[PDB]
Amino acid sequence: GDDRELAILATAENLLEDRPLADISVDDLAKGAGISRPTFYFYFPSKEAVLLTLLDRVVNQADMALQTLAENPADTDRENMWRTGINVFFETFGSHKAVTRAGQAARATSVEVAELWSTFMQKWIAYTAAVIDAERDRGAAPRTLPAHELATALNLMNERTLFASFAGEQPSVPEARVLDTLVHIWVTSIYGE
Amino acid sequence: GDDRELAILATAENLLEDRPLADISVDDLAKGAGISRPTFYFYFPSKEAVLLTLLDRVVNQADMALQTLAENPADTDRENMWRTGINVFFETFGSHKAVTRAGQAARATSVEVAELWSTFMQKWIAYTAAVIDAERDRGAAPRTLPAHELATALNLMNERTLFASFAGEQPSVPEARVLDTLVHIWVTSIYGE
Numbered sequence: 001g002d003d004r005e006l007a008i009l010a011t012a013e014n015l016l017e018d019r020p021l022a023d024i025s026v027d028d029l030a031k032g033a034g035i036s037r038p039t040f041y042f043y044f045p046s047k048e049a050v051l052l053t054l055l056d057r058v059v060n061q062a063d064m065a066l067q068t069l070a071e072n073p074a075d076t077d078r079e080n081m082w083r084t085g086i087n088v089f090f091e092t093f094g095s096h097k098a099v100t101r102a103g104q105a106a107r108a109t110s111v112e113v114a115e116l117w118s119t120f121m122q123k124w125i126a127y128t129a130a131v132i133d134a135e136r137d138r139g140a141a142p143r144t145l146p147a148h149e150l151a152t153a154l155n156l157m158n159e160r161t162l163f164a165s166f167a168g169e170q171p172s173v174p175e176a177r178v179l180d181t182l183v184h185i186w187v188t189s190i191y192g193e
Numbered sequence: 194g195d196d197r198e199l200a201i202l203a204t205a206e207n208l209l210e211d212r213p214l215a216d217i218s219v220d221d222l223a224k225g226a227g228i229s230r231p232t233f234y235f236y237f238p239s240k241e242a243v244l245l246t247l248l249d250r251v252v253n254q255a256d257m258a259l260q261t262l263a264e265n266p267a268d269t270d271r272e273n274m275w276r277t278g279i280n281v282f283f284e285t286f287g288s289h290k291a292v293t294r295a296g297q298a299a300r301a302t303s304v305e306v307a308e309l310w311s312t313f314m315q316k317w318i319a320y321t322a323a324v325i326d327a328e329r330d331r332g333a334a335p336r337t338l339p340a341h342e343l344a345t346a347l348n349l350m351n352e353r354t355l356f357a358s359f360a361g362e363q364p365s366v367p368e369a370r371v372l373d374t375l376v377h378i379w380v381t382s383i384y385g386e
C-alpha cells in the first residue's frame with residue numbers, strides 16, 4: 001500500500017533523470033511500479049501529483065536538515081557557519097537533480113508547486129534574517145540593510161544560482177565552484193560595510 | 194508595413210498587461226492592430242513570435258543603454274558606478290513589466306526565447322567580469338573569487354530578484370527597496386574580503 005506509493009515515487013524520480021514529466025506517461029509510471037493504470041489512480045490523481053509529492057519530500061528533507069543544524073551549533077567561524085548551512089541545500093537538491101529540475105519547471109503550471117516552494121522560501125528567508133539579526137545583536141555584523149530584505153535577495157540568488165549550476169545552464173557557475181561562490185557573497189554582504 | 198508590424202507589437206504589449214499570452218488570440222492581436230488574421234500571418238508566424246520580438250526589443254534597449262554608460266564614465270564613487278549600471282536594468286525591465294513577465298515565462302517553452310536571454314546574460318556577465326578585473330588591476334578591488342564566477346552569481350541574483358520584485362512574488366524584495374538591496378550585495382562582494 002504505502003509500498004506501492006513508494007514504488008510509484010521511485011519510478012517517477014528514475015524516469016525524470018532521462019526525460020521531462022511531459023514525456024512520461026501514467027502507463028510508464030504504473031509499469032515501472034509493477035501495478036496497473038487504474039491501481040495507479042488509487043494512489044495519485046495524475047503524474048503531476050506524483051511530482052508534487054517528490055518535490056514535497058525533497059523540500060522537507062532540506063528543511064529538516066536545516067532544523068538539525070539550527071539545534072546543533074557546529075563549533076566554527078562565521079564563514080563556516082554559513083557554508084554548512086548553504087551546503088544543506090547544495091547537497092539535498094544536488095542529490096535530487098531530476099526532481100529539482102522538474103519541480104522548478106512545474107512552478108509555472110502548478111499552483112500547488114508554486115505555493116510549496118513559496119512557503120518554504122518564506123521559512124528559509126525568515127530563518128536567515130533571524131540569524132543575521134542575532135549576529136547584529138551580538139556585535140558581529142554591522143546594521144546595514146534591513147535584514148529581511150538582504151535575506152530575501154541572498155535566498156533568491158541561491159535558488160537561481162544552484163538550479164542553474166545543477167541544470168548545467170549557460171550561463172552558470174560550475175557545480176564544483178558554486179558553494180565557494182555563494183559563501184563569499186553571503187559573508188561579504190552580511191559582515192561588510 | 195513597418196507600421197502594421199509596430200501596431201501588432203504595441204497591441205501585444207498592451208494585452209499582456211491584462212492577461213498571459215495563452216489567453217491572447219491572434220484574433221485579439223489582429224483586431225487591436227486593425228488588420229485581418231491573414232494579414233497578421235504576413236508579419237508574424239504566431240503570437241509566440243510577437244513575444245520573441247517584444248523581448249528582443251527590451252533586451253536590446255537594456256544592452257544599448259549599458260553600452261552608452263560604458264562609453265560615458267559617470268564621475269562618481271565605486272558604489273554609484275555599480276548603482277547606475279544596475280539601474281539600467283531596473284528601469285528598462287521595470288518600464289516593460291508585462292513583456293518581462295511573459296518573456297521569462299516563455300524561456301521554458303521557446304528555444305529562441307531561452308537562447309536570446311542566454312546570449313545577453315553571457316554578454317552582461319562578461320562585461321561585469323571585465324569591470325571587476327579593471328577594478329582589481331587598478332588596486333581598488335581585492336583578488337578574491339574568480340571574477341567571471343562572481344559576475345555570474347551576481348547577474349543571476351539580479352535576474353531572479355528583479356523579476357520577483359516586478360511580479361510582486363511572495364517572497365520578493367519590495368520594488369522600492371530592490372535597487373539598494375542589490376547595490377549593497379554587489380559592492381560588498383566585489384570590494385570586500
Ligand SMILES: CC1CCN(C(=O)Nc2ccc(O)cc2)CC1
Pocket residue numbers: 082085086087089090124125127128131155156158159160162
Ligand atoms: C540559514 C540559511 C543557510 C543558507 N540557506 C540557503 O542556502 N537557502 C537556499 C538555498 C537554495 C535554494 O533553492 C533556496 C534557498 C538559507 C538558510
Ligand SMILES: CC1CCN(C(=O)Nc2ccc(O)cc2)CC1
Pocket residue numbers: 275278279280282283317318320321324348349351352353355
Ligand atoms: C556592469 C553591470 C551592471 C549591472 N548589471 C546587472 O544589473 N545585470 C542584470 C540585471 C537584470 C537582469 O535580469 C540580468 C542581469 C550587469 C552589468
